[PDB]
C-alpha cells in the first residue's frame, strides 16, 4: 500500500527564505543553462516549431503569480524535508551567444555527503510514496481503469523515476552551496 506523508501541515520557516528565492533563481539559471547550448528565448506565439518558448522568463522580473513555476516545486522540498524530525543546521560560509547569461554553475559537477545519502534515498522514497498517491489523484476517479503501479518498491522501473530521484539531490546540493548542514541526529 502506498504510504503518504502529510506535507502542507508545516508552515514554511523564515530562516529558509533567503534559501528559497536564491535557490529558484539558481534553478533557473540552471535549467536555461540546459537551454543556454541551444538558445531558448521568450516568445509571443507558443509555436514550438520555430524553437521559441512561452516560459523563457527571467528571474529578475517575476510577479507575484508567474513565481507559482519557480515556487510550488520548491516548496515541497522542506515541508517533508523536516517531517522526519531532522533539522537543517549552520556550517562555515560557502558562495557565443547572449541574454540572461547567468555566472553560474549546473547540479551535476558536486559530490554527495556522508550525513547526507541516507536521507537523499529516504527523500527519494517518500517522491515515490507520495507520487503514488498522486496518480491516485488523476486518472482513477475520473472513470479510467485500475493502473499497474501498485508494484512493491525494489522492482518498478526508473525512466518514471527521472523526475523523482533527480530532485532529491540537488535540492541538499544547494544546502551545501549555500553551506547548510545536514544531520540525522
Known sequence: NPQPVDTSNITIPEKLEYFINKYAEHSHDKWSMDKLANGWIYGEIYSDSSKVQPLMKPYKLL????????????????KTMLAWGWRIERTREGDAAHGYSP?????????????????AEM???NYHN?????????????????????????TLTAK??????????????????????????
Open 103 to 119: 555566472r553560474a554553475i549546473d547540479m551535476s559537477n558536486v559530490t554527495l555527503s556522508r550525513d547526507l545519502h541516507a536521507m
Open 123 to 125: 527523500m527519494a522514497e
Open 63 to 78: 510577479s507575484e503569480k508567474e513565481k507559482e513555476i519557480y515556487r510550488w516545486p520548491i516548496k515541497e522540498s522542506l
Open 160 to 185: 518514471e523515476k527521472a523526475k523523482d530521484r533527480e530532485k532529491a539531490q540537488d535540492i541538499l546540493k544547494f544546502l551545501q552551496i549555500n553551506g547548510y548542514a545536514v544531520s540525522r541526529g
Open 130 to 154: 507520495i507520487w503514488a498517491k498522486k496518480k491516485k489523484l488523476e486518472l482513477e476517479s475520473k472513470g479510467g481503469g485500475n493502473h499497474p503501479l501498485l508494484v512493491p518498491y525494489d
